[PDB]
Amino acid sequence: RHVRIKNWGSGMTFQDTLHHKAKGILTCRSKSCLGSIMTPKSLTRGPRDKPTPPDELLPQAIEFVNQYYGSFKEAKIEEHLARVEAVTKEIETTGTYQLTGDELIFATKQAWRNAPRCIGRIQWSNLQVFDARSCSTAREMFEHICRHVRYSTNNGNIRSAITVFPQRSDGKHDFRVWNAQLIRYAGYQMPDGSIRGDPANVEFTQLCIDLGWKPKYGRFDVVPLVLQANGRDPELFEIPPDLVLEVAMEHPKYEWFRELELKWYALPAVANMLLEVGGLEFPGCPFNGWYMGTEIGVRDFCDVQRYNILEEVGRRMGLETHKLASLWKDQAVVEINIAVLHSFQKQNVTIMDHHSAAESFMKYMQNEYRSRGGCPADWIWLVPPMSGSITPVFHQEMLNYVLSPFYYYQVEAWKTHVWQ
Amino acid sequence: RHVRIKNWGSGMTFQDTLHHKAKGILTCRSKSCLGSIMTPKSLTRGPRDKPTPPDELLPQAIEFVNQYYGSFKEAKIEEHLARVEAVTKEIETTGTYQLTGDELIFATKQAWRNAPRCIGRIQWSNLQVFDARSCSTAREMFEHICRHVRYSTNNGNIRSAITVFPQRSDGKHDFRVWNAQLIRYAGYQMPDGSIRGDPANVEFTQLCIDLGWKPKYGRFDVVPLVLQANGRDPELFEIPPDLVLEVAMEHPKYEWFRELELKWYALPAVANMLLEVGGLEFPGCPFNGWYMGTEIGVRDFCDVQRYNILEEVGRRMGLETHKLASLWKDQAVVEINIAVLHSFQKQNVTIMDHHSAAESFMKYMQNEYRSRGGCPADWIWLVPPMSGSITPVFHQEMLNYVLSPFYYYQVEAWKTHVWQ
Numbered sequence: 001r002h003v004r005i006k007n008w009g010s011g012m013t014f015q016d017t018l019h020h021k022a023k024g025i026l027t028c029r030s031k032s033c034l035g036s037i038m039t040p041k042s043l044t045r046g047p048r049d050k051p052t053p054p055d056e057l058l059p060q061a062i063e064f065v066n067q068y069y070g071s072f073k074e075a076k077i078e079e080h081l082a083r084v085e086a087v088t089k090e091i092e093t094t095g096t097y098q099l100t101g102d103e104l105i106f107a108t109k110q111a112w113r114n115a116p117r118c119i120g121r122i123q124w125s126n127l128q129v130f131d132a133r134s135c136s137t138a139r140e141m142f143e144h145i146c147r148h149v150r151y152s153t154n155n156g157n158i159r160s161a162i163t164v165f166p167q168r169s170d171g172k173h174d175f176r177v178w179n180a181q182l183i184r185y186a187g188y189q190m191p192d193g194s195i196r197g198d199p200a201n202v203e204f205t206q207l208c209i210d211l212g213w214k215p216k217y218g219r220f221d222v223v224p225l226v227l228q229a230n231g232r233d234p235e236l237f238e239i240p241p242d243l244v245l246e247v248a249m250e251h252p253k254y255e256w257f258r259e260l261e262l263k264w265y266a267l268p269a270v271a272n273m274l275l276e277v278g279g280l281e282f283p284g285c286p287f288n289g290w291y292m293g294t295e296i297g298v299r300d301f302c303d304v305q306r307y308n309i310l311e312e313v314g315r316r317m318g319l320e321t322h323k324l325a326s327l328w329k330d331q332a333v334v335e336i337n338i339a340v341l342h343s344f345q346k347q348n349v350t351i352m353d354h355h356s357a358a359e360s361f362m363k364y365m366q367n368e369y370r371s372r373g374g375c376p377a378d379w380i381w382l383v384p385p386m387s388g389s390i391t392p393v394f395h396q397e398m399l400n401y402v403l404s405p406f407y408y409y410q411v412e413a414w415k416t417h418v419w420q
Numbered sequence: 421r422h423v424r425i426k427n428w429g430s431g432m433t434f435q436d437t438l439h440h441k442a443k444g445i446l447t448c449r450s451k452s453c454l455g456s457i458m459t460p461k462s463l464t465r466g467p468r469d470k471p472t473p474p475d476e477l478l479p480q481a482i483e484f485v486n487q488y489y490g491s492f493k494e495a496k497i498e499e500h501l502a503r504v505e506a507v508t509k510e511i512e513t514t515g516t517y518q519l520t521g522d523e524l525i526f527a528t529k530q531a532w533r534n535a536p537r538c539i540g541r542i543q544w545s546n547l548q549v550f551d552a553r554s555c556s557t558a559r560e561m562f563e564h565i566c567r568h569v570r571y572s573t574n575n576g577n578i579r580s581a582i583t584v585f586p587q588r589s590d591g592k593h594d595f596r597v598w599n600a601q602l603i604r605y606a607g608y609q610m611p612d613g614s615i616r617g618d619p620a621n622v623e624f625t626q627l628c629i630d631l632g633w634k635p636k637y638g639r640f641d642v643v644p645l646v647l648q649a650n651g652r653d654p655e656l657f658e659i660p661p662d663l664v665l666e667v668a669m670e671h672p673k674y675e676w677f678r679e680l681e682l683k684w685y686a687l688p689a690v691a692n693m694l695l696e697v698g699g700l701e702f703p704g705c706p707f708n709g710w711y712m713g714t715e716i717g718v719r720d721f722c723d724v725q726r727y728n729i730l731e732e733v734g735r736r737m738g739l740e741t742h743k744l745a746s747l748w749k750d751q752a753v754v755e756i757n758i759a760v761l762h763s764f765q766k767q768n769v770t771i772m773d774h775h776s777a778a779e780s781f782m783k784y785m786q787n788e789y790r791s792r793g794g795c796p797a798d799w800i801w802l803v804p805p806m807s808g809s810i811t812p813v814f815h816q817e818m819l820n821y822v823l824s825p826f827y828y829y830q831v832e833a834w835k836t837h838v839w840q
């Protein structure tokens with residue numbers, strides 16, 4: 001079946017066939033399309049109370065092994081059979097199986113390549129995998145994480161990496177990081193009702209306070225690492241401030257921008273997602289890349305539910321903040337995003353503008369169809385939050401579907417935890 | 421059954437129940453979502469060569485009548501019941517029916533209310549209907565269209581209106597305007613490969629030329645109205661220039677913008693669409709509203725597949741047109757959109773900025789849920805192509821579905837029509 005995909009900007013046409021190997025878990029039906037649901041149950045992998053029944057695990061395990069060995073330009077016929085045989089045994093004798101070191105590396109990279117919402121996928125093959133499946137205590141998790149942070153930060157020359165903690169066995173012995181990101185700022189609900197800091201982390205900040213963390217009521221306070229070792233209650237750890245690289249915001253023209261006293265961290269490390277590989281689940285697998293300007297400038301800074309600094313900037317710029325039609329909102333957002341890119345560049349830290357990112361993704365998408373004839377793509381997430389149609393991804397028709405390996409969301413640990 | 425959708429910017433939630441009455445025709449499967457396809461077959465409504473079977477039409481006819489009488493605040497028990505039998509009898513005898521003049525008024529306004537891609541639906545219950553089902557000749561159609569244009573243009577103060585041509589019967593006697601829009605610039609393919617004018621009209625203009633139209637090889641050449649009556653062959657008609665209101669483009673601060681010598685028509689009138697009312701189809705039904713700034717500024721002017729003035733303006737502003745990270749494209753887009761709004765305000769022509777548009781639609785969507793417990797919406801088309809996340813529609817989760825009445829696309833006439 002050849003579902004024809006077309007790019008109305010360049011006339012480029014694609015034939016998607018890969019969508020057949022997809023897992024039919026999406027909620028979209030013939031009567032209604034719900035592609036705009038942010039965090040659907042379909043892309044979520046809930047917690048369990050008992051291991052995956054060997055009956056549904058086996059076919060998935062083999063399916064993965066086939067894909068792994070099939071990825072080789074060569075033909076390893078023997079090793080392939082030996083492994084598929086070895087795994088089948090392990091599942092029938094232990095109820096689960098372990099991935100080899102190389103299979104894990106292929107798994108993580110392939111899952112990235114399968115992330116329909118990631119726009120930096122042109123780098124899918126360039127990832128540093130840290131094996132921490134041997135981990136056993138929260139204290140060790142902290143050390144593994146600091147290793148990751150020290151690496152990926154790399155004195156400003158950010159580089160992608162991922163740390164894989166021991167897979168899910170019972171579902172009662174989960175190894176996971178509660179924090180949405182390794183590095184994130186605190187959010188505090190102030191007495192006057194307003195929120196000081198990042199609104200997105202108000203709830204998680206409370207959890208940190210309940211666990212003992214002392215609030216500092218600042219706008220950019222780095223939240224402590226809330227780590228969980230095999231089902232045990234989580235323990236707090238403070239990322240040494242030396243490892244947290246930040247960039248102070250400033251404009252190449254508006255010297256008053258410094259007055260806003262803004263800043264942001266350099267490392268975007270999502271930490272609460274789950275890696276699914278041939279039936280196995282890794283609830284603890286923090287990964288990172290480098291930032292795309294708009295993520296901070298448009299979203300983190302101008303969302304009403306985030307720092308919301310838009311009006312303050314429009315006023316400082318002396319724009320008509322009352323006449324909407326003045327397009328004051330659009331100028332402000334642009335100057336803010338310039339401040340971001342500028343600041344990261346003046347401080348020798350890796351950042352990527354949304355134009356360069358988009359053009360690189362087109363190159364990537366093309367490679368996908370030429371190689372494996374398919375590319376899972378969520379238009380709603382790939383198109384930048386500012387100047388949408390000015391980028392080629394806006395003009396690209398795309399199919400969104402779930403494959404395997406894959407990075408699923410999770411129900412934030414605390415909401416389902418069984419405290420002791 | 422309730423499907424919950426939330427707006428992450430305001431926190432507000434809605435419970436959609438209206439999606440149950442949707443016609444299951446969307447191509448989104450459980451395995452893959454194709455909501456990013458521009459003009460899918462599901463939203464298209466092809467040609468016929470055999471009338472709609474009365475067997476098949478009766479349900480749809482009754483359904484509309486009930487929906488019609490259901491709109492009234494009172495109760496018209498008597499007239500309702502009478503109309504139901506009158507229609508049943510009429511379809512039984514003739515094999516089709518004729519909606520009353522007032523029903524046509526309701527249908528057009530309702531189909532607008534049911535257009536999931538229109539962001540200006542807040543104006544739904546405000547439309548001027550021109551009943552032209554009595555029409556019989558191409559010449560007549562032209563006379564009707566000229567009425568619509570004069571009425572809607574209203575010397576600057578734009579007004580919404582729709583002109584309904586005779587309903588399809590055999591499917592061999594269609595009455596329709598082949599033009600994508602009433603007023604639209606031509607596009608020529610110059611001898612050096614390049615394109616002069618609007619690229620999106622190359623094929624259409626070529627047709628006009630084939631039909632004896634003299635290419636004026638200019639940039640903003642208003643292409644002739646290609647009308648079709650009773651399924652005959654189309655006849656050319658040049659819309660009287662005095663009726664075509666244009667707006668000269670100029671910036672409030674950039675004196676040199678005038679030198680760009682740009683302009684655009686004030687009347688956005690989609691002609692090539694099909695209105696479906698209770699099983700009946702009208703291949704001819706031009707409609708219009710007023711422009712939203714971004715349609716001209718972001719799309720028509722900046723698209724690579726359109727006028728593509730982006731680089732010219734950038735160089736004109738003296739921006740680093742070679743360093744993407746300078747965000748010159750974004751600054752250029754903003755000023756171009758500021759020029760569009762300014763030009764219209766100056767010439768006293770009606771236009772709406774995407775910010776006022778989105779905030780008005782936010783109110784419309786809330787009312788729809790209060791009213792019918794639903795509001796079909798295509799996120800991908802509703803979020804402005806500029807500063808997406810700065811508008812509330814960006815943060816609004818939504819369901820997209822086909823109701824009735826509705827405005828469907830069609831297969832471009834020349835692409836199917838059999839020439840006499």
Ligand code: HEM
Nearest residue numbers: 112115117118119120123160161287288289290291292407
């Ligand atoms: C090379 C740098 C990278 C860039 C520039 C990039 C950029 C992006 C962007 C712009 C998003 C949207 C996030 C949001 O709007 O909240 C995204 C999402 C995502 N990316 Fe990447 N990415 C990079 C690296 C990675 C890596 C290394 C992985 C995984 C191994 C990855 C996995 C994903 C996933 C799964 C999402 C979805 C996050 C969510 O749903 O909240 N990305 N990426």
Ligand code: HEM
Nearest residue numbers: 532535537538539540543580581707708709710711712827
């Ligand atoms: C009050 C003024 C109106 C505004 C501000 C408005 C605005 C819009 C916008 C921005 C679009 C997208 C245009 C594009 O990207 O091609 C649109 C689409 C649409 N509007 Fe409205 N609209 C208005 C009136 C109308 C009227 C009067 C009708 C019908 C009677 C209507 C029916 C639709 C439909 C069917 C679409 C889809 C067009 C397509 O798919 O090509 N709109 N409208």
Ligand SMILES: C[C@H](O)[C@H](O)[C@H]1CNc2nc(N)[nH]c(=O)c2N1
Nearest residue numbers: 036037038380381814815816817
């Ligand atoms: C409602 C809608 O799904 C939601 O606002 C989405 C839109 N697109 C997005 N795209 C990205 N990259 N990130 C987001 O958080 C969102 N939010």
Ligand SMILES: C[C@H](O)[C@H](O)[C@H]1CNc2nc(N)[nH]c(=O)c2N1
Nearest residue numbers: 394395396397456457458800801
């Ligand atoms: C590929 C994608 O569907 C296409 O570029 C869409 C995106 N959103 C749009 N939205 C509007 N209003 N109009 C368009 O023409 C488009 N183009």
Ligand SMILES: NC(=[NH2+])NCCC[C@H](N)C(=O)O
Nearest residue numbers: 268288289290291292295296
């Ligand atoms: N490029 C990335 N790795 N992005 C990961 C998500 C970062 C998130 N959007 C933030 O603003 O903090």
Ligand SMILES: NC(=[NH2+])NCCC[C@H](N)C(=O)O
Nearest residue numbers: 688708709710711712715716
């Ligand atoms: N506001 C409207 N009625 N828009 C209808 C579509 C007009 C089309 N987007 C154009 O730029 O020509």
Ligand SMILES: [Zn+2]
Nearest residue numbers: 028033448453
């Ligand atoms: Zn869908």
